[PDB]
Protein backbone atom coordinates (compact mmCIF):
# COMPACT_ATOMS: atom_id res chain seq x y z
CA UNK A 1 0.00 0.00 0.00
CA UNK A 2 1.25 3.44 -1.00
CA UNK A 3 0.07 4.71 2.39
CA UNK A 4 2.51 2.33 4.08
CA UNK A 5 5.31 3.10 1.61
CA UNK A 6 8.42 5.07 2.56
CA UNK A 7 9.16 6.49 -0.90
CA UNK A 8 8.47 10.08 -2.06
CA UNK A 9 7.58 8.81 -5.54
CA UNK A 10 4.61 6.66 -4.57
CA UNK A 11 3.47 9.46 -2.27
CA UNK A 12 1.38 11.42 -4.77
CA UNK A 13 -2.35 10.76 -5.09
CA UNK A 14 -2.36 7.52 -3.05
CA UNK A 15 -2.45 5.41 -6.22
CA UNK A 16 -1.96 2.13 -4.34
CA UNK A 17 -2.24 0.28 -7.65
CA UNK A 18 0.67 2.35 -8.95
CA UNK A 19 2.68 1.66 -5.80
CA UNK A 20 2.15 -2.09 -5.43
CA UNK A 21 3.04 -2.29 -9.13
CA UNK A 22 6.67 -1.70 -8.14
CA UNK A 23 6.63 -1.94 -4.36
CA UNK A 24 6.06 -4.92 -2.07
CA UNK A 25 3.03 -4.96 0.23
CA UNK A 26 0.85 -7.93 -0.67
CA UNK A 27 -0.51 -10.21 2.03
Q: Would you tell me which residues interact with Zn ion (CB under 5 A)?
A: 5, 7, 10, 19, 23
Binding residues for Zn(2+): 5, 10, 19, 23
Burial 1-27 (b: 16+ CB within 10 A, else e): ebeebeeeebeeeeebeebeeebeeee
Binding residues: 5, 10, 19, 23
Query: Cβ 27 to Zn ion, closest distance in Å?
Result: 16
Could you list the beta-strand ranges (E) of 1-27: none
Amino acid sequence: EVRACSLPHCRTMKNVLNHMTHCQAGK
